[PDB]
Structures are given as C-alpha cells and as structure tokens.
Amino acid sequence: METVMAGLQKTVMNELNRVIVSIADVPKLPAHRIRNLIAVLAAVSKPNLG
C-alpha cells in the first residue's frame, strides 16, 4: 500500500491519480459477499465496466 501512496500524485489535468474510498468500519456482510463487491468496485472504473 505504501508503495501505491508514494506515487499518488496529481496529473496534468489538475486531477488526482486515483479515486480514494477510505473505509473505517465495514458494513455487516459475509466475507464472501464482501470479496464479491470488491470485484465489482475494481471493474466499475474500466471502460464499459470491464
């Protein structure tokens, strides 16, 4: 993670490199259901939703 945060600069479009979604506490869900939505969140950014 700290390698990722080191290169987390602002681009030339006055734009951050990535979108930050900071999770303090986790909604009560089964672990497998949590892993599945991480798959979705990694793909929501891709063109045509991956």
Partner: protein, 50 residues
C-alpha cells in the same frame, strides 16, 4: 434467435426514452475531503440514517 429479437430493424427508428443524447463530464468523488475529516475527527462517518 437474434433475428427474432428484432436485430434486423433500421437502427434509426430506435429512440431514447428522453429523445435526447448526452455527453457527461462531471467532477466526481475523490475522497480527500472525507479522509481529511476523519483524521480531524470532525465528521468521521458521513453516511446518514436515511
């Protein structure tokens, strides 16, 4: 099974339900405001009861 789903139609007779097109370029969520407010303990949880 695809000709039976009207894949043969003139694509100029298919209308959007608004009758309009759209090109959206919106400044979006980055997450720097929420992570800043968490470290200062000002507004740690932004999700409301609704």
């Amino acid at each position: 099974s695809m000709l039976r789903n009207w894949s043969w139609v003139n694509v100029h007779n298919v209308h959007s339900v608004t009758g309009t097109s759209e090109n959206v370029v919106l400044a979006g969520y980055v997450g720097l405001s929420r992570t800043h407010d968490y470290i200062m303990d000002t507004r740690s949880t932004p999700a409301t009861s609704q």
